[PDB]
RNA sequence: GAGACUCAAAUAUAUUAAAUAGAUAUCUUCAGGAUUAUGGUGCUGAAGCUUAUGUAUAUGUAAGUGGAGCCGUACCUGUUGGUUUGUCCCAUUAUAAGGACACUAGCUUCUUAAAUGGACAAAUUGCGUCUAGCAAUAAUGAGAUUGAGCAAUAACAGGUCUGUGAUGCCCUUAGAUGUCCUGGGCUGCACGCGCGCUACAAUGAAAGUAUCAACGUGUAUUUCCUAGACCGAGAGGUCCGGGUAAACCGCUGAACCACUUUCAUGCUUGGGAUUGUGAACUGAAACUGUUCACGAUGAACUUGGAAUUCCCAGUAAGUGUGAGUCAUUAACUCGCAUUGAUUACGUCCCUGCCCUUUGUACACACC
């Protein structure tokens, strides 16, 4: 029943709530598609419905989850990272910070010289993956 | 105790109201499936194609382009519900209605890129019965695809408008649009 | 037992139709069996007939019986 | 003494197996211990799939290899000198011969 | 105004491609009279063949 | 669909014919069973090919001087 | 020791081996060993045991730098079929 | 690019006037009653349910892929 | 006529009714996580239709009997197709081999199945004789929807 | 040479057997249902449910709750064991066996392979020199039956000295170009190509659920296929059992597919690139990567120009599987089943090639 709610904001993305509640989460760095299964479900959203619906209550408790989701149940596996390796804190990575640990996890490997380290640098593929035929566009 | 029925359909009072298009649109005058499902072995002679039922042909017909292919079981729900449509939107036998559509879709002429000596001028080419049928049915059935593709509109849906719109020849219909520039070429090369 | 959901199962609509004209050899008469026969072998759908059609065997620089790989040039 | 005994023999040829089964059934049949003859088995065809190039380049024909080998049983039950001779007669070409105690 | 017009003698092969069966109609209307027109694809003896144009009558370019 | 019968058919079937054409009929049954007992064909398929010619050489003959 | 003991044993009528008379070449042919004489003479030979057909190839280059190939063929010979 | 990412919700204005709509729809079916603006293909099939609940649609065909109902005739 | 629902094999009414019937005895213990649960390698998401593990269960248990001993390996096998492993190949690759096997394990607390020698689960105590009551009573409901039918006309 | 031939794919168990696969009938066993019929307890209180306790969640007992069914059998459907001349009384540890009985209380329609028979374009009729043949029809399992294998004379400076310890000559050979040990490349990317794989959706994806296989293959001086029990989301970890295999994994009950939902054409829930991450596995050792799951990040691609491959029936196309290579490594390759078309049943037009006809001063032959 009703209307509204159309572009909702959790933490620093936008959100289009045109699309039903975890697909929409896709435009959240951290939150694509298959977390919604752990998130909403154990937050429990009717999960027949759109991310432009449901309460804002809900919304927190949606964020709650995926910020902190060892004390919901979600085992460690489940986790973005298990181990780190600083703090070796058990964390899902949300939003901004993903792109900030990503960025630093280059940068010790950068400093030490590294075949990882460097081969994100000069860029191309850090997995080994052959460019003879591909890597290019 | 003999004879009765496609899926709850009437086979008896099913006239192909066009000859030539008799018997090279083969309803069911003695041959009373339930199914169109069939082993359906009409490969290996020319004019077996002629026996089997203007039904069973729209399900073989309807499963191409290549993901698509060969799941006769797909095919035969969708022509069952093509059928109630059909008898929903004009009222009647689905049977009659789908004989008609393929009748007024069948294509008059065609020309042949005959190779006359620089300029390659066509000439024109009146069209065999035994290509009328089949043609109709796969227009019928490309007209189903266009519209039900970026459509929400289902397939069955989609086939029951291709097939109403041919039967009371509204055209519309891509079938005729098509093929009515084919007989034109025909019309200007001789 | 075997091949697959159509294959069998078309199969059973074979292994019936012919069956019941057995009985009518041996108990009953020609004259169930003949009636039957007509019926079967005119509508027809293979009822009577085993079918022969089976799996060619697929060919050298193909993965498909005659479906050849590749690109020559010309 | 009826020790009850199986006789396993797996070999090649066609022809040459039959005839090795052949006798030993009817020695048996003769001499009634009235066997349970001949169990025919199915014949493994063992295959290998090679092109037919050393050195790869030519227009690809694979030749392909088979081999079918040929398994057969025959039950007697005797004891002594029966078992031994109807084993060691019908041997020479290119028959296993295995012999069970049960 | 359509006539239909029976499929009497399939007569051969005309085409560079070969596509082409030429064809001896007697039509079903008025019988008495013999026309010639060259049909599309394949044709067997009493096809029916619908003359949108009820005379005119091509022939053959080998 | 194709092909008229090889030589190795064909040549034995002229070759009894001429001399065993009392005991050759129209029908092919007993021509097949004429064919194993007279000559000396080392397989079947062959055998049933060569008193098959000799039915339809025989068939011919019967329709007017072949 | 003597779980495996090897008979000697005649091969039959000799002539038709192929075998034999290829092991025959190649003693003639180290001896030196005139061509016509050689290949017509094995090929008479082992028709003369009675042999239906036989063909002897020589691909190989006499004297001269370039590989030739002759087959000298005297028979009835298949070639093909099982 | 013609966008069209229309409305889930039921939207109780368009509800009502989904109920006057539906009789000449013929073909009345999820898809035909967004084609009438307010796409829903799913929760219009919810909508069908809820229709069949005595009063407008004859199902003949219950599909999954193709769900055909009509306005209750002539 | 008598009775007859198939006699241990699923179909389609069967399968979803037996299931119900597990939601509403509620004994079946649901590992935690199963609405995260993929069932698969093959599958990328797991149940849009959440309710899968009632379903699962009745599937499995249905399943069983008829091989007489159906674990964990055999399972994988069966259910779960058809892999989608990333960008090469389409290919069948194994279901998850722990998500099919809990739910047999859950039936196993449910009681609804025996030990067997020869096999882990041969269920012709108690676990037959639930399944072959609920599905006699499926019929029997079927019957019960057509009795109700014959005088509406409609 | 082609062929004929042989093999495999199609038909009769009529013929030979059978540790499989099975008609189905008997005996025996366990389970449910009342549709129908009958008997037994029951409003004098039945089934069911709950709690406590004792004993090993189950059972018994006590109490409460409950309010008309509950149980057995014929019958029907399903399960298990023996039942391919069986069973019993006797033998043997268990068959045959001996005597009795069923006197057939399981045969082979169906697996597998021994052997036969089955297609000859048979019958007829159009067509044709009324020839060889062709076309059509009916009968048939198959209408010259469908597909391979096998292959000549003669030709090529085709490819291969890196299969070969077959091999000429030369080189190399106490500083190896042999070989081994350690480490790296083959796996490097401005860029041209070729095979593919995967997509662009909605005849669909997402998700439940229906569920049907086959060809091959598997541990002997070994560490293979692994059923079944537990933990784990998954990879895997962990203990047992079967199988050197018509026996067991395995009917490889595989995928596409069936059915019902969710979603709605929006680079979208299509697509799955890349990415930092990430638990183990194989190995002495895993860094332009050995491999792999989950968790994550979430690209082009919205049907591909000139060109060009392949294809006429279980063929095409979709779709999986098994085998090989192999310690690890499949987008490969070879077979196999499955679902199963649209369309020619024409012709030499394009392409390629042979054959006649011609010219030739070519003949180590138009490189």
């Known amino acids: 029943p009703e209307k509204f709610q159309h572009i909702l904001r959790i933490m620093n993305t936008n959100i289009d709530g045109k699309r039903k509640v975890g697909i929409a989460m896709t435009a959240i760095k951290g939150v694509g598609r298959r977390y919604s299964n752990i998130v909403l479900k154990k937050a429990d959203v009717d999960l027949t419905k759109r991310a432009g619906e449901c309460t804002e209550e809900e919304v927190d408790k949606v964020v709650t989850i995926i910020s902190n989701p060892l004390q919901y149940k979600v085992p460690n596996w489940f986790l973005n990272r298990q181990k780190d390796i600083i703090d070796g804190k058990y964390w899902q990575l949300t939003s901004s910070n993903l792109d900030s640990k990503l960025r630093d996890d280059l940068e010790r490997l950068k400093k030490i010289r590294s075949h990882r380290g460097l081969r994100h640098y000069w860029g191309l593929r850090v997995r080994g993956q052959h460019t003879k035929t591909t890597g290019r566009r | 105790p003999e004879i009765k029925l496609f899926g709850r359909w009437s086979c008896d009072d099913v006239t192909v109201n066009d000859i030539s298009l008799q018997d090279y649109i083969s309803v069911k005058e003695k041959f009373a499936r339930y199914l169109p499902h069939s082993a359906g072995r009409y490969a290996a002679k020319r004019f077996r194609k002629a026996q089997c039922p203007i039904v069973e042909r729209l399900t073989c017909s309807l499963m191409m382009k290549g993901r698509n292919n060969g799941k006769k079981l797909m095919a035969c729900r969708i022509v069952k519900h093509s059928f109630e449509i059909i008898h929903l939107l004009t009222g009647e036998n689905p049977l009659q209605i789908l004989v008609s559509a393929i009748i007024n879709s069948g294509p008059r002429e065609d020309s042949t890129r005959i190779g006359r000596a620089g300029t390659v001028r066509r000439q024109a080419v009146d069209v065999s019965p035994l290509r009328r049928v089949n043609q109709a049915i796969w227009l019928l059935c490309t007209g189903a695809r266009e519209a039900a593709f970026r459509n929400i509109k289902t397939i069955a849906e989609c086939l029951a408008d291709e097939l109403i719109n041919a039967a009371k020849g509204s055209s519309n219909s891509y079938a005729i649009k098509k093929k009515d520039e084919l007989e034109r070429v025909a019309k200007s090369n001789r | 037992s075997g091949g697959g959901h159509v294959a069998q199962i078309y199969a059973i609509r074979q292994a019936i139709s012919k069956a019941l004209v057995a009985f009518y050899q041996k108990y009953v008469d020609e004259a169930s069996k003949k009636e039957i026969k007509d019926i079967l072998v005119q509508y027809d759908r293979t009822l009577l007939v085993g079918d022969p059609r089976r799996c060619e065997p697929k060919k050298f620089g193909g993965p498909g019986a005659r479906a050849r790989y590749q690109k020559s040039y010309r | 003494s009826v020790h009850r005994i199986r006789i396993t023999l797996t070999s090649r040829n066609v022809r040459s197996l039959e005839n090795v089964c052949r006798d030993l059934i009817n020695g048996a049949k003769n001499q009634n211990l009235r066997v349970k003859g001949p169990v025919r088995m199915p014949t493994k065809t063992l295959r290998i799939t090679t092109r037919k190039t050393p050195c790869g380049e030519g227009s690809k024909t694979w030749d392909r290899f088979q081999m079918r080998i040929h398994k057969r049983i025959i039950d007697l039950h005797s004891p002594s000198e029966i078992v031994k001779k109807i084993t060691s007669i019908n041997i020479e070409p290119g028959v296993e011969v295995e012999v069970t105690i049960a | 105004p359509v006539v239909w017009a029976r499929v009497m003698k399939v007569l051969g092969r005309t085409g560079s491609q070969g596509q082409c069966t030429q064809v001896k109609v007697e039509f079903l209307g008025e019988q008495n009279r013999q026309i010639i027109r060259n049909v599309k694809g394949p044709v067997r003896e009493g096809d029916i063949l619908t003359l949108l144009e009820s005379e005119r009558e091509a022939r053959r370019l080998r | 669909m194709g092909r008229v019968r090889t030589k190795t058919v064909k040549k034995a079937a002229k070759v009894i014919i001429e001399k065993y054409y009392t005991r050759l009929t129209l029908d092919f049954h007993t021509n097949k069973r004429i064919c194993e007992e007279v000559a000396i064909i080392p397989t079947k398929p062959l055998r049933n090919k060569i008193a098959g010619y000799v039915t339809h050489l025989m068939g011919r003959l019967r329709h007017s001087q072949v | ?82 | 690019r013609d966008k069209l990412n229309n409305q889930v919700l039921f939207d109780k204005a368009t509800y009502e006037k989904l109920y006057k709509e539906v009789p000449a729809y013929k073909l009345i079916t999820p898809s035909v009653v967004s084609e009438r603006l307010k796409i829903r293909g799913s929760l219009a099939k919810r909508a069908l349910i809820e229709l069949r609940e005595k009063g407008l649609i004859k199902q003949v065909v219950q599909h999954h892929s193709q769900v055909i109902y009509t306005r209750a005739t002539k | 006529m008598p009775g007859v629902t198939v006699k241990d094999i699923d179909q389609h009414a069967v399968t979803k009714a037996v299931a119900v019937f597990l939601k509403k005895t509620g004994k079946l213990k649901v590992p935690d996580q199963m609405d995260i649960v993929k069932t698969a390698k093959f599958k990328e998401l797991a149940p849009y239709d959440p309710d899968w593990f009632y379903v699962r269960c009745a599937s499995i248990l249905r399943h069983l009997y008829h091989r007489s001993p159906a674990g964990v390996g055999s399972i994988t096998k069966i259910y779960g197709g058809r892999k989608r492993n990333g960008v090469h190949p389409s290919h069948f690759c194994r279901a998850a081999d722990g998500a099919a096997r809990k739910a047999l394990q859950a039936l196993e607390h449910a009681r609804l199945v025996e030990k067997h020698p020869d096999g882990g689960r041969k269920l012709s105590s108690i676990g037959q004789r639930d399944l072959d009551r609920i599905a006699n009573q499926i019929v029997f409901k079927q019957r019960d929807a057509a009795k109700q039918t014959g005088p509406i006309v409609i």
């Open chain 7, 1 to 82: 020791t003597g779980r495996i003991e090897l008979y000697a044993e005649k091969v039959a009528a000799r002539g038709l081996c192929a075998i034999a008379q290829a092991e025959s070449l190649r003693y003639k042919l180290t001896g030196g060993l005139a061509v016509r004489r050689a290949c017509y003479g094995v090929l008479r030979y082992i028709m003369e045991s009675g042999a239906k057909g036989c063909e002897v190839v020589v691909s190989g280059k006499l004297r001269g730098q370039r590989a030739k190939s002759m087959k000298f063929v005297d028979g009835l010979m298949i070639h093909s079929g099982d």
